[PDB]
């Protein structure tokens, strides 16, 4: 009954309002742009029509949804605001894909275990535990650096981590920020930061660059100016605003001794993560998972191929199997033999080396 | 060059005497000329040279 | 339940506005809407400009009564008798006044010393106050005297007949509290902190760069009492004397343009400039020279006692057991600036968290030094 009472005057009032908007809404409706916001009940507008008319805003749309430089709808002869335009373009920034929860996990690699705890404690752990950060009173590191011969576990570990962590992953290719155009490169780094802030919490994966390698002793040079001009703005963004979790940074570089200590800045980055070289046991572990996928046979001697191997990371190993698997496929058999493994192990050995040895230190 | 950012990298052979004979044949099917010519001789006349 | 109420809210506002638009529609009207983000009991009647947008321009003058001032590509039309009252201040255009170009057209409001259009970061008051003081201690003492004191007690300086500097310079590594210090005074001093990134000002096409420098200064003048924070000016700060060799000229033009405004006819006003360099050496003698740059405020290797104050700041958040003393360790530890001193502490809390303890320990501290000593050397 209380409802009925509100309802009796309301229904008509409800219709009347809809009639009133329709009068404004009436075709056509021209897009135009709000130049700037003059807070003493004014604003600057640029019209590509002709007439402009200073109006009071409707109550559906407010000025709190108006931003400077925004697109809005104007009528073509009473030039008034029906609504703000709701059609926005593509992020124009440098190469990015955003992905929520990727397929892969970190249970597939093995024997690498220690490194895996390091990223764990930094990134994953505060999300899991508020109050452990409160006791200590501090943030886990803003960002980490993963360093090794290009992604054989660096790349693997990142993919895995995004699923775990359950926030948006954005992967940016850093070389692509470099442009030989005066405006372009700086605009991009500032758009990259802009994009982060909206999507927060978010993970930033920075793929290695050439441009983080050079600082010299000048702060800018008559050489390629842009690479350092850009390098600086990376720093300004970082040392201007610290995140505990709003942005998490994964940085990647082939060698970290290329980097600059300016770039690190202690108290943002405290963690430097190093992939050990191939260690003999590890090779067998990594392998056992790769063979499982594939056909296997009772004439395979798993150790013998691993033993024959020395200083080869998981990628070549993943590769050997794939190569061999192709040979088999040509034979139109799904049975694997020793022979297959031998030719593939030889091809990859042939290609990496032509050097001479520095051993025999005994 | 870092492996697994690679799959197959395939050689393309530098041309040869057998090869040259049959490209010449393909080309000839575009234009009209005499019948009773020995083309076999003609490829041989050629040293090495591109397709 | 909520819905009934929301519908009633649209409708009541609509009826009053429809009457007002019908009325405003007659005789036409300025740029096209009202946005409020101040108060309605303070309303300006001077509005910013550098070009004159006109839409009607109704006025009172004898030589004609609806005079116009444009410069626009199509309709650059102007007064029919020079310098006769036209805009009605900022009536029917909201920035109608005068054109920078000139056609001997009336000026009720200037094309310079205005905020106009911008791309700016203005950053309302911070929250930080003391967070690395101890060796940042000297830098604080001087910065207050230069920036704060003239604004607090100007009347005193006049009696003496002394005028305070216009700019101070910051150097050493950023994010060590060199950076913090500028925000920490900005919050205390209560004057707008305006952040311009010099590197951004750099543009793809010439003359634009100068234009920007100029715009900044016009806004700066209007507001009197403001701080211009220049982030790592060296991009368009000095290095350079070589006089071009291929677009080392374009960046040099900006550097020279700034000098003109500083050394020029303007005067200081209540405007303060904070400059940020890596090593000050880079910068050119013109940038260094008195009659713009006078005080250079420095950073330093922090004394032992100092380190302790920083640690003291940190120890309020961090659960501790005080029966051990960090200063003894600190003498043994590498001498390093403020940022490493906070970082070792921060590292210390983690070890606890793994240990499954809630209070600090003597044990944690030993560990931190080995990593940190490694981290500078990469």
């Amino acid at each position: 009954i209380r409802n009925q009472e509100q309802m009796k005057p309301l229904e008509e009032k409800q219709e009347e309002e809809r009639s009133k908007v329709d009068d404004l809404r009436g075709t056509p409706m021209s897009v135009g742009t709000l130049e700037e916001i003059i807070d003493d009940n004014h604003a600057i507008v640029s019209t590509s029509v002709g007439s402009e008319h200073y109006v009071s805003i409707l109550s559906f749309v407010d000025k709190d949804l108006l931003e400077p430089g925004c697109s809005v709808l104007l009528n073509h002869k009473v030039h008034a605001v029906i609504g703000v335009l709701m059609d926005d373009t593509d992020p124009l920034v440098t190469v990015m894909k955003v992905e929520k929860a990727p397929q892969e996990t970190y249970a597939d690699i093995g024997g690498l275990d220690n490194q895996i705890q390091e990223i764990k404690e930094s990134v994953e752990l505060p999300l899991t535990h508020p109050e452990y950060y409160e006791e200590m009173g501090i943030k886990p590191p803003k960002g980490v650096i993963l360093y090794g011969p290009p992604g054989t576990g660096k790349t693997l570990l990142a993919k895995a981590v995004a699923n775990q962590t359950s926030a948006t992953f954005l992967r940016v290719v850093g070389s692509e920020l470099i442009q030989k155009y005066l405006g372009d490169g700086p605009k991009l780094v500032r758009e990259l930061f802009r994009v982060a802030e909206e999507h927060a919490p978010s993970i930033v994966f920075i793929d290695e660059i050439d441009a983080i390698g050079t600082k010299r002793y000048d702060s800018n040079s008559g050489g390629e100016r842009e690479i350092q001009r850009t390098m600086l703005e990376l720093l300004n963004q970082l040392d201007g605003f610290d995140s505990r979790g709003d942005v998490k940074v994964i940085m990647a570089t082939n060698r970290i001794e290329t980097l600059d200590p300016a770039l690190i800045r202690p108290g943002r980055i405290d963690r430097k993560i190093e992939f050990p070289l191939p260690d003999e046991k590890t090779k067998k572990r990594i392998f056992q998972i790769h063979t499982s996928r594939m056909t296997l046979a009772d004439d395979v001697t798993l150790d013998d191929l691993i033993m024959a191997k020395d200083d080869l990371s998981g990628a070549d190993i993943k590769a050997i199997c794939t190569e061999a698997g192709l040979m088999a496929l040509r034979e139109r058999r799904m049975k694997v033999t020793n022979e297959d493994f031998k030719k593939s192990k030889e091809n990859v050995l042939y290609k990496k080396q032509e050097g001479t040895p520095e051993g025999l230190y005994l | 060059l870092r492996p697994g950012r690679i799959d197959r990298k395939i050689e393309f052979p530098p041309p040869n005497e057998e090869a040259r004979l049959d490209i010449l044949k393909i080309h000839s099917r575009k234009m009209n000329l005499t019948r009773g010519i020995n083309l076999r001789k003609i490829a041989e006349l050629m040293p090495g040279a591109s397709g | 339940i909520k819905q009934v109420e929301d519908d009633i809210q649209q409708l009541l506002k609509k009826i009053n506005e429809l009457t007002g638009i019908k009325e405003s529609d007659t005789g036409l009207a300025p740029p096209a809407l009202w946005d409020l983000a101040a108060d309605k009991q303070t309303l300006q009647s001077e509005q910013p400009l550098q070009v004159a947008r006109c839409t009607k321009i109704i006025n009172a003058d004898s030589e004609d009564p609806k005079y116009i001032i444009n410069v626009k590509q199509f309709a650059k039309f102007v007064v029919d008798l020079s310098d006769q009252v036209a805009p009605t201040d900022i009536e029917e255009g909201m920035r109608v006044g005068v054109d920078r170009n000139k056609y001997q057209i009336h000026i009720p409001l200037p094309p310079k010393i205005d905020p106009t259009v911008t791309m700016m970061q203005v950053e309302e008051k911070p929250d930080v106050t003391y967070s690395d003081v101890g060796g940042c201690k000297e830098q604080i003492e001087k910065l207050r005297e230069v920036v704060e004191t003239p604004l607090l007690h100007p009347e005193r300086f006049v009696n003496l007949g002394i005028e305070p500097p216009k700019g101070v310079l910051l150097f050493g590594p950023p994010g060590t509290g060199k950076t913090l210090c500028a925000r920490a005074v900005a919050n205390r001093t209560d004057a707008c902190f305006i952040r311009v990134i010099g590197s951004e000002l750099v543009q793809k096409y010439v003359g634009e760069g100068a234009r920007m420098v100029r715009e900044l200064f016009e806004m700066a003048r209007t507001k009197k009492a403001c701080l211009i924070f220049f982030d790592e000016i060296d991009a368009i700060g000095g290095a350079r004397f070589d006089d071009g060799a291929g677009g080392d000229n374009e960046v040099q033009r900006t550097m020279l343009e700034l000098i003109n405004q500083l050394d020029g006819f303007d005067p200081r006003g209540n405007i303060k400039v904070l400059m940020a360099t890596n090593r000050p050496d880079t910068l050119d003698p013109a940038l260094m020279r008195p009659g713009r740059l006078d005080r250079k405020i420095e950073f330093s290797l922090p004394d032992l006692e100092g380190r302790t104050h920083i640690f003291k700041i940190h120890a309020r958040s961090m659960s501790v057991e005080r029966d051990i003393r960090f200063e003894l360790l600190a003498r043994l530890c590498p001498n390093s600036t403020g940022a490493e001193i906070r970082s070792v502490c921060t590292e210390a809390g983690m070890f606890a968290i793994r240990a499954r303890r809630k209070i600090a320990t003597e044990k944690d501290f030993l560990e931190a030094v080995n990593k940190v000593i490694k981290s500078y050397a990469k």
Side-chain angles (χ1 to χ4, degrees):
Chain A
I1 189 64
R2 321 297 181 152
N3 298 314
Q4 186 192 324
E5 298 208 59
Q6 291 144 224
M7 179 189 190
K8 303 159 189 174
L10 186 65
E11 169 173 66
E12 188 64 49
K13 282 178 174 35
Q14 191 181 26
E15 286 176 305
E16 281 179 300
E17 213 300 313
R18 294 186 277 215
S19 315
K20 283 172 198 281
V21 287
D22 288 339
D23 297 293
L24 300 82
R25 190 53 164 181
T27 56
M29 307 79 83
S30 197
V31 175
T33 39
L34 210 175
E35 302 295 283
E36 52 166 320
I37 310 186
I38 312 304
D39 307 317
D40 291 311
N41 298 102
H42 299 313
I44 301 300
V45 157
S46 173
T47 193
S48 293
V49 192
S51 283
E52 291 171 359
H53 297 83
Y54 180 39
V55 300
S56 304
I57 192 149
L58 313 171
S59 50
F60 296 88
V61 39
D62 291 314
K63 61 275 170 266
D64 308 317
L65 309 182
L66 299 174
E67 299 310 296
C70 71
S71 289
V72 285
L73 295 174
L74 291 180
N75 186 245
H76 68 287
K77 69 197 174 299
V78 157
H79 305 85
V81 51
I82 191 61
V84 37
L85 172 62
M86 315 286 287
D87 283 0
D88 295 285
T89 204
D90 184 67
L92 312 171
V93 70
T94 204
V95 196
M96 59 81 141
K97 277 192 298 176
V98 196
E99 315 182 301
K100 229 185 174 317
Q103 289 172 340
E104 324 300 334
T105 198
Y106 64 101
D108 278 80
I109 56 164
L112 292 290
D113 74 303
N114 290 339
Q115 282 69 266
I116 314 309
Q117 276 83 255
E118 310 189 70
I119 208 170
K120 265 180 191 289
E121 287 159 359
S122 186
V123 173
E124 182 166 42
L125 192 138
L127 302 172
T128 306
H129 300 286
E131 13 78 58
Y132 293 168
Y133 72 68
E134 301 189 300
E135 291 172 345
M136 303 313 144
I138 45 160
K139 51 190 191 77
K142 184 185 189 65
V144 295
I145 301 185
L146 298 165
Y147 47 87
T152 182
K154 308 171 65 199
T155 191
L156 309 178
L157 177 65
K159 296 194 291 198
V161 87
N163 198 22
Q164 291 192 75
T165 51
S166 309
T168 51
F169 191 72
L170 191 160
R171 187 136 172 197
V172 30
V173 192
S175 273
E176 294 290 287
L177 275 165
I178 305 169
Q179 287 285 286
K180 38 172 176 184
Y181 309 116
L182 289 85
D184 294 41
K187 277 286 206 309
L188 294 165
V189 287
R190 165 186 205 75
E191 289 196 63
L192 183 69
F193 192 58
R194 162 173 82 154
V195 171
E197 289 193 298
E198 300 164 63
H199 301 138
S202 198
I203 304 84
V204 192
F205 189 79
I206 313 171
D207 283 85
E208 69 177 27
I209 335 179
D210 202 54
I212 51 188
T214 302
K215 202 178 175 304
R216 318 189 170 85
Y217 226 65
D218 287 307
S219 298
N220 216 254
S221 316
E224 184 53 66
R225 314 190 55 91
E226 202 65 58
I227 42 160
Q228 302 191 281
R229 190 175 281 120
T230 52
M231 194 175 63
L232 279 158
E233 297 159 315
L234 311 179
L235 322 184
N236 291 349
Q237 280 161 343
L238 283 170
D239 290 16
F241 172 71
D242 295 316
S243 290
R244 177 168 311 216
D246 312 291
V247 182
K248 300 265 46 69
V249 193
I250 299 174
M251 300 216 164
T253 188
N254 176 350
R255 296 280 63 100
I256 193 183
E257 56 177 82
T258 54
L259 315 195
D260 279 300
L263 205 274
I264 313 170
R265 177 63 61 199
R268 270 84 299 188
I269 303 182
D270 296 298
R271 306 293 205 90
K272 292 169 167 73
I273 295 178
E274 187 160 15
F275 284 73
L277 304 164
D279 304 274
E280 194 56 34
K281 57 176 192 305
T282 313
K283 294 188 177 78
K284 181 185 175 176
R285 303 199 86 193
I286 287 291
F287 186 58
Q288 276 166 356
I289 314 293
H290 312 162
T291 321
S292 301
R293 177 184 182 197
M294 270 299 291
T295 59
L296 39 160
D298 297 299
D299 72 300
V300 187
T301 308
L302 303 169
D303 293 314
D304 183 54
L305 307 168
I306 306 298
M307 171 179 88
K309 300 183 170 71
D310 276 276
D311 66 287
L312 287 168
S313 306
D316 313 304
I317 300 162
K318 286 165 178 52
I320 278 157
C321 304
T322 304
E323 190 161 35
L326 196 85
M327 300 176 170
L329 184 52
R330 183 172 64 236
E331 323 304 291
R332 315 188 74 229
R333 294 184 296 128
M334 55 75 154
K335 188 174 176 295
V336 82
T337 34
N338 297 306
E339 323 312 331
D340 300 347
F341 292 125
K342 187 58 162 49
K343 292 169 202 282
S344 290
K345 195 179 64 68
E346 290 178 277
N347 281 8
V348 186
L349 185 59
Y350 176 70
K351 284 202 272 315
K352 51 165 187 172
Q353 290 180 5
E354 186 54 295
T356 43
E358 63 166 20
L360 296 180
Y361 273 116
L362 300 164
Chain B
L1 281 154
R2 186 72 174 66
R5 317 178 153 85
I6 79 174
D7 307 277
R8 314 302 172 264
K9 298 183 263 76
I10 38 164
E11 200 280 317
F12 187 76
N16 310 285
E17 197 39 274
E18 314 89 85
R20 283 185 286 250
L21 176 52
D22 311 301
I23 160 171
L24 183 70
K25 186 64 172 179
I26 306 307
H27 285 52
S28 64
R29 307 195 61 159
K30 288 164 182 59
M31 48 78 149
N32 298 260
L33 63 153
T34 194
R35 200 167 193 160
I37 169 164
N38 171 235
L39 303 177
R40 199 62 226 87
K41 194 184 174 198
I42 316 301
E44 282 174 69
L45 296 186
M46 324 174 186
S50 183
Chain C
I1 317 306
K2 307 291 169 182
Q3 61 200 280
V4 170
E5 308 296 288
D6 187 63
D7 280 306
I8 296 164
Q9 193 250 95
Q10 327 307 105
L11 188 60
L12 290 169
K13 304 182 167 182
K14 258 73 201 324
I15 302 154
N16 191 7
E17 73 196 282
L18 275 182
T19 330
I21 64 146
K22 287 165 181 174
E23 165 70 295
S24 284
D25 277 16
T26 62
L28 215 91
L33 80 178
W34 312 5
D35 285 324
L36 191 72
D39 55 301
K40 301 172 67 75
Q41 312 296 306
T42 310
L43 296 163
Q44 289 183 107
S45 302
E46 289 74 56
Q47 292 180 236
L49 52 158
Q50 67 158 97
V51 268
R53 176 70 212 191
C54 303
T55 317
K56 182 189 174 181
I57 317 299
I58 182 56
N59 49 289
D61 184 77
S62 283
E63 305 316 293
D64 280 308
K66 193 194 158 290
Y67 274 134
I68 69 178
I69 292 186
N70 289 288
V71 58
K72 265 179 288 173
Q73 177 65 80
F74 289 157
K76 43 181 89 281
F77 305 107
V78 277
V79 302
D80 298 349
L81 174 40
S82 294
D83 296 298
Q84 289 315 116
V85 185
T88 307
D89 311 10
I90 27 78
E91 191 175 25
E92 294 256 14
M94 293 173 165
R95 64 183 280 145
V96 58
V98 67
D99 297 320
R100 42 172 65 196
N101 281 70
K102 303 181 194 58
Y103 297 103
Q104 305 182 129
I105 35 170
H106 177 73
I107 314 179
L109 296 167
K112 288 279 197 297
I113 317 301
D114 302 283
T116 189
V117 303
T118 37
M119 178 170 180
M120 72 317 183
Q121 182 171 66
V122 185
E123 187 173 287
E124 46 41 62
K125 307 66 168 312
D127 42 75
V128 300
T129 36
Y130 305 118
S131 294
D132 202 70
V133 56
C136 318
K137 202 152 68 68
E138 299 309 79
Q139 184 176 142
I140 283 150
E141 289 160 7
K142 301 190 193 288
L143 196 53
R144 291 190 146 180
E145 284 297 54
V146 187
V147 183
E148 293 199 76
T149 318
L151 285 174
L152 298 170
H153 289 99
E155 66 302 300
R156 185 144 66 228
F157 285 64
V158 180
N159 301 104
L160 297 143
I162 49 168
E163 299 83 57
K166 189 172 174 33
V168 305
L169 185 50
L170 300 94
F171 56 105
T176 61
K178 158 278 195 66
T179 43
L180 288 167
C181 185
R183 303 184 175 210
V185 165
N187 190 17
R188 306 171 181 174
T189 202
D190 300 88
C192 66
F193 195 63
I194 306 192
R195 318 191 67 199
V196 285
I197 301 175
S199 298
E200 297 293 345
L201 303 176
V202 182
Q203 243 279 110
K204 193 52 173 156
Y205 313 90
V206 303
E208 306 289 295
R211 195 185 296 273
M212 309 312 177
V213 169
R214 291 165 56 175
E215 281 180 80
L216 182 276
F217 233 61
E218 289 168 41
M219 189 156 51
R221 215 84 181 79
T222 308
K223 305 312 173 287
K224 285 63 91 283
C226 68
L227 288 91
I228 313 299
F229 181 41
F230 289 89
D231 296 85
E232 305 316 310
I233 167 155
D234 309 288
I236 49 168
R240 286 195 306 270
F241 14 79
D242 291 304
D243 299 291
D248 316 286
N249 161 240
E250 286 183 358
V251 297
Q252 204 183 51
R253 195 185 294 106
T254 326
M255 188 184 59
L256 280 163
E257 174 63 49
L258 189 82
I259 285 168
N260 300 328
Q261 295 290 345
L262 291 154
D263 213 86
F265 294 85
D266 302 283
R268 58 187 69 71
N270 291 263
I271 309 153
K272 267 73 196 57
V273 171
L274 296 185
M275 274 187 266
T277 192
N278 169 204
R279 279 210 180 187
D281 297 298
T282 67
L283 312 187
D284 288 309
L287 316 185
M288 296 175 171
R289 185 180 287 107
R292 35 175 290 172
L293 184 66
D294 290 294
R295 196 76 285 113
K296 290 170 179 57
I297 65 167
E298 71 302 303
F299 71 109
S300 47
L301 286 176
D303 185 57
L304 303 159
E305 305 191 289
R307 297 195 197 152
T308 305
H309 309 158
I310 311 176
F311 184 78
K312 279 178 157 180
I313 280 169
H314 282 72
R316 214 271 67 171
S317 305
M318 182 73 65
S319 300
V320 286
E321 45 190 79
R322 283 299 93 181
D323 39 75
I324 48 171
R325 186 88 288 285
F326 187 71
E327 78 192 64
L328 202 73
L329 303 186
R331 322 188 70 163
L332 288 188
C333 296
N335 168 322
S336 309
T337 55
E340 279 77 50
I341 299 312
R342 293 183 283 185
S343 294
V344 286
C345 203
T346 314
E347 190 172 75
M350 315 304 292
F351 301 129
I353 307 172
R354 301 173 68 180
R356 318 297 177 195
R357 279 286 285 102
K358 199 257 162 62
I359 324 160
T361 184
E362 187 51 283
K363 315 168 190 296
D364 292 336
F365 291 121
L366 309 188
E367 291 156 89
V369 195
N370 303 293
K371 186 60 177 282
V372 90
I373 186 166
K374 297 174 186 76
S375 284
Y376 195 94
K378 303 177 203 88

